[PDB]
């Protein structure tokens, strides 16, 4: 409000006055709801449990459950599952993702040998912001599984692209590292009150050569007839 700047001035001088505010109520209700959901689903001891239709199932339930906990516990799924719930309540829709990860890393040990160590292999999960999902607009969001395509907007670190190329996951790499510099044009942004615009973006030089930064990318899954798309018969 216009009257506010004056009040702030008074406060600086030592006096006191009224500055305006928006009442809390609604926030409190969202927060109370989020709690109900976290307690009902996430804070439980097993989280994912299995029930069996026939006798054969009973034999397999105990083991399956164990393998599922390794994955929630050792794959750090829960931090991301809390957000999915907030999002739905806050924005109206919440989108999550799933993938399989085999992780390997290298470490130098002293003379001066190198080693490849094997880490977690299992499913991992992630959250897609509201502004990042790309859906099929011709089927309902509820009916997403029926439509032709779904995809997400993502940022990929150059170092990762390069490592992947060795394994065989990626290709056309030379052309890609070129875009590190101007790749990020951010169209949909957060509210002005929220900060983190960033600077000297993604461009840290390295001692001998190259630069280390990210490239904007999109991942899409499509249902297709191979003959038509040229990818097979």
């Amino acid at each position: 409000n216009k009257k506010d700047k004056a009040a702030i001035e008074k406060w600086n001088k030592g006096d006191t006055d009224f500055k305006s505010l928006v009442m809390p109520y609604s926030y409190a209700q969202l927060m109370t709801a989020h709690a109900y959901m976290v307690n009902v689903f996430l804070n439980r001891d097993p989280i994912f449990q299995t029930d069996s239709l026939n006798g054969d199932g009973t034999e397999r339930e105990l083991a399956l459950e164990s393998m599922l906990q390794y994955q929630v516990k050792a794959g750090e799924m829960e931090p991301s599952l809390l957000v999915w719930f907030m999002d739905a309540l806050r924005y109206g829709v919440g989108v999550l993702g799933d993938y399989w990860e085999e992780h390997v890393f290298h470490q130098t040990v002293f003379v001066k040998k190198t080693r490849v160590v094997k880490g977690y292999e299992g499913c991992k999960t992630f959250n897609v912001m509201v502004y990042d999902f790309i859906p099929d607009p011709r089927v309902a969001l509820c009916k997403y599984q029926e439509g032709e395509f779904f995809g997400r907007r993502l940022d990929l670190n150059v170092l990762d692209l390069k490592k992947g190329a060795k394994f065989g996951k990626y290709f056309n790499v030379e052309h890609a590292e070129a875009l590190v510099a101007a790749s990020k044009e951010e169209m949909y942004r957060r509210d002005p009150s929220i900060g983190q615009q960033r600077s000297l973006k993604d461009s840290t030089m390295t001692p001998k050569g190259k630069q280390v930064g990210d490239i904007s990318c999109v991942e899409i899954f499509v249902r297709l007839v191979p003959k038509d798309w040229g990818l097979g018969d």
Binding site: F48, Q71, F85
Partner: protein, 154 residues
């Protein structure tokens, strides 16, 4: 009953029983629509993607034989034999264990009943379900991971 004027105990329980109801209905929607999807997906991958060796390492002594882990791809595709469960209607393993203990008592008596069931296994199973998870170690002969793999290999 949200209005409060000196509520007694039944009254107190009553408005909260009722207020929760609209929130529980949301949960139920969430559970069927999206939690289920995630859960089913995780189950498919764990069954198909993990190799048998990895399955022993992640699951250990819980794998009492071939049946416990091995599965044909048909089952994975048709989703047969097991169903995902969630927070909204949880399963109580403790109750199940107590029934099993009663069954075992009956099998002990009535020697004819005893002839056609394997009592030791019922004891091991009940204990594991209750949560002990170490009964196997206590047994005179203990199976190591390498030993289990060999058994699975059949």
């Amino acid at each position: 009953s949200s209005p409060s004027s000196r509520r007694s105990a039944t009254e107190f329980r009553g408005t909260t029983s009722f207020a929760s109801s609209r929130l529980a209905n949301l949960a139920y929607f969430f559970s069927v629509t999206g939690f289920r999807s995630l859960a089913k997906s995780l189950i498919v991958k764990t069954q198909q993607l993990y190799t048998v060796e990895m399955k022993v390492k992640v699951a250990g002594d819980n794998i009492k034989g071939a049946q416990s882990i091995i599965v044909k791809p048909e089952d994975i595709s048709g989703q047969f034999d097991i169903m995902p469960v969630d927070g909204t209607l949880p399963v109580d393993r403790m109750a199940q264990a107590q029934f099993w203990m009663q069954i075992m008592s009956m099998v002990a008596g009535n020697p004819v009943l005893g002839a056609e069931y394997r009592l030791g296994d019922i004891f091991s199973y009940t204990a594991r379900l209750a949560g002990l998870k170490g009964i196997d170690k206590m047994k005179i002969r203990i199976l190591d991971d390498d030993q289990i793999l060999a058994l699975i290999l059949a």
